[PDB]
Amino acid sequence: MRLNTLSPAEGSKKAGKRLGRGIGSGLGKTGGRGHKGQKSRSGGGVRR
Amino acid sequence: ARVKRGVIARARHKKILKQAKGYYGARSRVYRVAFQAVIKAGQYAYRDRRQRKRQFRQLWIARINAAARQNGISYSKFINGLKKASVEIDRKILADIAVFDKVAFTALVEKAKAALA
Amino acid sequence: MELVLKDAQSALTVSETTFGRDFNEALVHQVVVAYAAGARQGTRAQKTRAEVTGSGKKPWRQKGTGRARSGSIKSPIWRSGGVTFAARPQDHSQKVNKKMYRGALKSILSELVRQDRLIVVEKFSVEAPKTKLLAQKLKDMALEDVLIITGELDENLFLAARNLHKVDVRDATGIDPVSLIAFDKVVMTADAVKQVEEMLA
Amino acid sequence: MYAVFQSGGKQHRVSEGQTVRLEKLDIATGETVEFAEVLMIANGEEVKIGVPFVDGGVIKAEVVAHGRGEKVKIVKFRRRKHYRKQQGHRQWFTDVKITGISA
RNA sequence: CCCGGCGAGGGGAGUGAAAAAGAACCUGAAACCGUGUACGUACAAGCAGUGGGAGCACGCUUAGGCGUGUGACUGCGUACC
Ligand SMILES: [Mg+2]
Ligand SMILES: [Mg+2]
Ligand SMILES: [Mg+2]
Ligand SMILES: [Mg+2]
Ligand SMILES: [Mg+2]
Ligand SMILES: [Mg+2]
Ligand SMILES: [Mg+2]
Ligand SMILES: [Mg+2]
Ligand SMILES: [Mg+2]
Ligand SMILES: [Mg+2]
Ligand SMILES: [Mg+2]
Ligand SMILES: [Mg+2]
Ligand SMILES: [Mg+2]
Ligand SMILES: [Mg+2]
Ligand SMILES: [Mg+2]
Ligand SMILES: [Mg+2]
Ligand SMILES: [Mg+2]
Ligand SMILES: [Mg+2]
Ligand SMILES: [Mg+2]
Ligand SMILES: [Mg+2]
Ligand SMILES: [Mg+2]
Ligand SMILES: [Mg+2]
Ligand SMILES: [Mg+2]
Ligand SMILES: [Mg+2]
Ligand SMILES: [Mg+2]
Ligand SMILES: [Mg+2]
Ligand SMILES: [Mg+2]
Ligand SMILES: [Mg+2]
Ligand SMILES: [Mg+2]
Ligand SMILES: [Mg+2]
Ligand SMILES: [Mg+2]
Ligand SMILES: [Mg+2]
Ligand SMILES: [Mg+2]
Ligand SMILES: [Mg+2]
Ligand SMILES: [Mg+2]
Ligand SMILES: [Mg+2]
Ligand SMILES: [Mg+2]
Ligand SMILES: [Mg+2]
Ligand SMILES: [Mg+2]
Ligand SMILES: [Mg+2]
Ligand SMILES: [Mg+2]
Ligand SMILES: [Mg+2]
């Protein structure tokens, strides 16, 4: 064991979602929000 | 950690502008105009790998017709007569014998006439 | 278990559950990563659009001039404007469970024994606080990169090792997981071995 | 003197001493291959036509190379629909040399 | 030292490891503007490419065909968000 020979367990290091970074990533442009609503706006949504 | 985009961005524009050489005007000098041109040239090349097989069969057929009508038979009757004689040579080879060996082509026509008779 | 001794060919008895375990790599990685996170300072910041100098005047009127609409000179789209998601000072430390921190120590110590990187002696000291004196002793035992764990702190052993960057001195109460891995060889006196088992148990 | 045979879903007209590029064969780079399905043999105004194969005709060759062809690019694009995709390709071949034609 | 208006600017000589390090001075990208060479172009109709394809120039090292630049003529084809 050395400082450059340790690795984590498989399945514990899921990567986060990054929106709006091109066509190929699957989340570009609208970034998962759809088209033209109150829910698509910055800060938008209704109270509980 | 601040990240600067200069070195990566420059190498990515040079890749597109090298695929676009020989084009006219801004289509080989300007990135915005040249990127569209490279995209359209790939669309055309995909389509023309299909049309290439169509344009060559159409050319072989027109040369077999010309060489058959000179031996007293048409393309339609020649092709039907070879199927009844069990001759499996294809269009590409037939249009090559017709140009470079006219003695062997006549032998094929006499075999198709005999089958039809 | 049973640990041999190099300077006196004796035998010393230790616990199996502290020196005979198998290596839990996933557990060790978590504790080592949390150690280096606890070393950070976190001192930095930038300025948002509300912290840049300048007034709140609208640069030009809303309609009629033929330009895109503007509302502030401190906009994060303009040159010399704010940073959209500016940073603040923050704390990067993580929590480690007590039983998890102690379990990772026992598998590090258990693996040093398998690879022959741990050696036990009765005594280890020098007469005077001289660097030349300690350097000579290490060369006789054929050691270059080494970590020395001693039962009780020594004034002369601490001073003689200060100017050698490849040699480090501790006591039993001051062990950390990262320096047990980073050093080529580990030297522990008999007194140190006794206290380490007691604090681990 | 030439003959016509088929190999790899295509047909070829060859003369002795020629090198022909075919589809990939499962033969080592030094061995000899055999083609016993011959469609016609023309030997200077003496012509044999197979119905569908010439009886007793066979062509001998020797494998001389293996490799991959030039690379082509596949580009797909749907305008105004937020869709794009690309791919590359490289096709395997086998070169043989015609050593003997016999009827 | 020489040309020039006892100019601006430049060519030599010299310094320096280097002056295409000469003060508009480290490196010195792109748009944009020129000089030279090869090929095409003055009876020809349109998103300027793509599939086919002669001729010319040039390098070939098994003299074999191959590589590189140009592109007459011809099928298909109304940019991107
Ligand atoms: Mg999608
Ligand atoms: Mg969603
Ligand atoms: Mg929108
Ligand atoms: Mg709607
Ligand atoms: Mg809606
Ligand atoms: Mg909605
Ligand atoms: Mg939106
Ligand atoms: Mg909004
Ligand atoms: Mg808002
Ligand atoms: Mg930095
Ligand atoms: Mg880019
Ligand atoms: Mg330019
Ligand atoms: Mg250029
Ligand atoms: Mg651009
Ligand atoms: Mg100000
Ligand atoms: Mg106000
Ligand atoms: Mg005001
Ligand atoms: Mg600022
Ligand atoms: Mg605690
Ligand atoms: Mg389109
Ligand atoms: Mg005057
Ligand atoms: Mg002067
Ligand atoms: Mg000099
Ligand atoms: Mg320097
Ligand atoms: Mg400079
Ligand atoms: Mg330049
Ligand atoms: Mg000319
Ligand atoms: Mg002319
Ligand atoms: Mg003319
Ligand atoms: Mg006319
Ligand atoms: Mg017209
Ligand atoms: Mg015109
Ligand atoms: Mg038209
Ligand atoms: Mg063309
Ligand atoms: Mg072509
Ligand atoms: Mg010419
Ligand atoms: Mg001409
Ligand atoms: Mg055309
Ligand atoms: Mg058309
Ligand atoms: Mg059109
Ligand atoms: Mg259209
Ligand atoms: Mg469009």
Give an overview in words:
It is classed as ribosome. This is part of a larger assembly, with chains A (48 residues), B (117 residues), C (201 residues) and D (103 residues). Chain A has no helix or strand. Chain A is low in regular secondary structure and 48 residues long. Chain B has one domain. Chain B has helices at 6-19, 31-69, 75-83, 91-100, 102-116. Chain B starts with 5 loop residues before the first helix and ends with a helix. Chain C has seven helices and six strands. With 201 residues, chain C is an alpha/beta fold. Chain D has 103 residues and is mainly beta. Chain D has one domain (1-103). In chain D, a hairpin with a 2-residue loop joins strand 1 (2-7) and strand 2 (10-14). Chain B binds chain D through residues 39, 42-43, 45-46, 49, 85-90, 92-93, 96-97, 101, 103-104, 107-108, 111, and chain D through 4, 11, 13, 39-40, 42, 45, 47, 49-52, 72-77, 86. Residues 31-32 of chain B line the site of one magnesium ion. Chain B binds one RNA strand of 81 nucleotides through residues 6, 10, 13, 22-25, 27, 29-33, 35-37, 39-41, 43-45, 47-49, 51-52, 55-56, 58-59.
Specify the biggest β-sheet of chain D.
Answer: 4 strands, antiparallel
Number of strands of chain B: 0
Shape of chain B: rod-shaped
Query: What compounds are bound to the protein?
Result: magnesium ion
Provide key terms for this protein.
part of a larger assembly; 4 chains; B: 117 residues; mainly alpha; 5 helices; 74% helix; C: 201 residues; alpha/beta; Ribosomal Protein L4, Chain: A; two-stranded antiparallel ribbon; 7 helices; elongated; binds magnesium ion; RNA-binding; structural constituent of ribosome (chain B); RIBOSOMAL_L20_CS (chain B)
What's this model, at a glance?
Chain B has one domain (1-117). Helix content of chain B is 74%, strand content 0%.
Please outline the helices and strands.
The structure is cut from a larger assembly and holds chains A (48 residues), B (117 residues), C (201 residues) and D (103 residues).
Chain A: no helix or strand
Chain B: H1 6-19, H2 31-69, H3 75-83, H4 91-100, H5 102-116
Helix pairs in contact in B: 1-2, 2-4, 3-5
Chain D: E1 2-7, E2 10-14, E3 19-22, E4 32-35, E5 38-42, E6 47-49, E7 58-68, E8 72-78, E9 83-89, E10 92-102
Antiparallel strand pairs in D: 1-2, 1-5, 3-10, 4-7, 5-6, 7-10, 8-9
The complex binds magnesium ion (42 copies).
The structure holds one RNA strand of 81 nucleotides.
